[PDB]
Amino acid sequence: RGELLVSLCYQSTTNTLTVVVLKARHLPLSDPYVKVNLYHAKKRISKKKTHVKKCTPNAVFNELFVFDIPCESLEEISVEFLVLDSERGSRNEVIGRLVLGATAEGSGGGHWKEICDFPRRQIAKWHMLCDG
């Protein structure tokens, strides 16, 4: 399913979280874009999406987004990244998915821990994409 490079920074004193969708590579040619959903517990509270890159298994997005965090910490916040193939005339297929959050299974888990442990530091990591 490929890999996705993302950078996040938690502005702890101002309750914002900045998320940069940097690049994807080794995607399963597709016309990728990335959708970013922000959840508070299980409720989606915000969504963003990048521009689409045409016909390529590797795509530089470089898109920074700013999220408002409606609570005093990231404990119940999670971020969902969806790499989708833009296709006219049909529903866009999910190429891969990545979740970061306090209970996220590994990759996503450690990156989120670091984000919470180091507020105000932008941290970037490559993650393997899962089925979505």
Cα–Cα distances in Å, from 44 out to 20, 48, 60, 64, 100? 19, 11, 26, 19, 14
Looking at beta carbons only, is 53 or 97 nearer to a copy of itself? 53
Q: Which of 64, 94, 102, 130 binds a copy of itself (CB under 8 A)?
A: 64
The entry of Ca ion, Cl ion, a copy of itself, none that residue 103 binds, CB within 5 to 8 Å by partner kind: none
Residues in the chain: 132
12 contributes a contact to Na ion by CB under 5 A? no
Scanning 36-44, 59-67, 99-107, 123-131 for contacts with Ca ion by CB under 5 A, the matching segment is 123-131
Scanning 5-13, 16-24, 70-78, 88-96 for contacts with Na ion by CB under 5 A, the matching segment is 88-96
Look up tokens 């891969």; give the residue. Answer: 96
CA dihedral 11, 12, 16, 20 (to 10 degrees): 40
Give the C-alpha separation, 77 to 14, whole Å.
15
15 contributes a contact to Na ion by CB under 5 A? no
Where do contacts with Cl ion occur on this chain (CB under 5 A)? Answer: 35, 44, 47, 62, 65-66, 73-74, 116, 125-126
